[PDB]
Amino acid sequence: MVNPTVFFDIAVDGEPLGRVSFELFADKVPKTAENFRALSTGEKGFGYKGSCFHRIIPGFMCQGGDFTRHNGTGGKSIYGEKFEDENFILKHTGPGILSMANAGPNTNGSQFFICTAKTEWLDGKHVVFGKVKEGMNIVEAMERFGSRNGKTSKKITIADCGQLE
Amino acid sequence: XLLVXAGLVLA
DSSP: OOOOEEEEEEEETTEEEEEEEEEEOTTTSHHHHHHHHHHHHTTTSOOSTTOBOOEEETTTEEEEOOTTTSSSSOOOBTTBSOBOOOOOOSOOOSTTEEEEOBSSTTOBOSOEEEESSOOGGGTTTSOEEEEEEEOHHHHHHHHTTOOTTSOOSSOEEEEEEEEOO | OOOOBSSSOOO
């Protein structure tokens, strides 16, 4: 009866930057939260470890999760390639929101984004399922390698990840 | 513009 806490250790060109901890709202979106949790432990044989943040736009968000093609076209869920939009109870209310990227209605795989600002235009379209619990300062340092068009100037990698609780 | 998609990214 406790929401999982997951962590990512971020590296910039192999150099360790720090740890970001996330609280996953398994009490509101159990199946989206579980997908993210299991991809962070790597327990199904595949996951986030070693993958990158392929698209970062300062003031907007940091996008990652494509562990198969590393460019925005791949990734899959623990349920098969894609799964449904569970619900839209939570909104993109400010910095630190963790939400799912997609290619339209009911197309969730493994790609996600961490909001750097309130992005109310994404409400009802992207499922919010967690928030940054510790290390928002590491996300702010990550944005500095992003650009208006999303290209990063440095390789931002998840060097390790797992579950803390 | 400022969207978050997987595959065809929009302006």
